[PDB]
Amino acid sequence: VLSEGEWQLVLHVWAKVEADVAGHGQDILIRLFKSHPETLEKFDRFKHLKTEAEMKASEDLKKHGVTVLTALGAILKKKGHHEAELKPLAQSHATKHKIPIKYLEFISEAIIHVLHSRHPGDFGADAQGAMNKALELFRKDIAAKYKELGYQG
């Protein structure tokens, strides 16, 4: 289900992301919070931000965007061989933050939306299919770790 060619498509669009990690991460989180506002409830100090301009001007939200894309990039670059990177993320998101897999689906949809909006010429059907499979693998593997930790979300 991911060939080496599909991993190259994932990593090619990822290189485009890496031209501006902060701006992509801001836009991904803003998209997630506008599409699925219940996710904001997990963030004590984004949940009171009243407007898109306030979210874009928040240095903390920008830093979070970088933290999320740095961890995800490190995972994608392993082309599936991501146990050591993914295990601690599962641990925190299951046991501390309590993030259900459906919220990982929502942020995956936000990732695809922003990548396509910013890079349509590098993110056609085949590259989208490859990224969807890579994100599905990430979510499948995190869900298995969730269960191993006793969290069934």
Please work out, in degrees rounded to the nearest 5, the angle formed at the alpha carbon of residue 103 by the alpha carbons of 141 and 12.
Answer: 60
Interacting residues with ligand HEM between 44 and 103 (CB under 6 A): 67-68, 71-72, 89, 92-93, 97, 99, 103
CA angle 127, 129, 130 (to 5 degrees): 65
Q: Does 29 bind ligand HEM (CB under 6 A)?
A: no
Closest separation in Å from C-beta 29 to ligand HEM: 9
- Distance of closest approach, residue 18 Cβ to ligand HEM, in angstroms: 15
DSSP strands (E only) in the chain: none
Residue in the shown chain whose Cβ atom is closest to ligand HEM:
92
User: First CA to last CA across the chain, in angstroms?
Assistant: 25
64 assigned binding-site residue: yes
# residues near ligand HEM by CB under 6 A: 15
Cβ-based nearer residue to ligand HEM, 100 or 121 = 100
DSSP one-letter code for 78? T
Amino acid identity, residue 80?
G
DSSP conformational letter for 118 = H
Q: 81 labelled as ligand-binding? A: no
**What dihedral do alpha carbons 15, 17, 21, 22 form, nearest 10°?**
170
Does 107 interact with ligand HEM (rule: CB under 6 A)? yes
The answer for residues whose C-beta is within 8 angstroms of residue 18's C-beta and 6 or more apart is 73
The answer to whether 35 contacts ligand HEM (rule: CB under 6 A) is no
Query: Considering the rule CB under 6 A, would residue 151 count as an interface residue with ligand HEM?
Result: no
Binding site for ligand HEM (CB under 6 A): 39, 42-43, 67-68, 71-72, 89, 92-93, 97, 99, 103-104, 107
Binding-site members are 64, 93
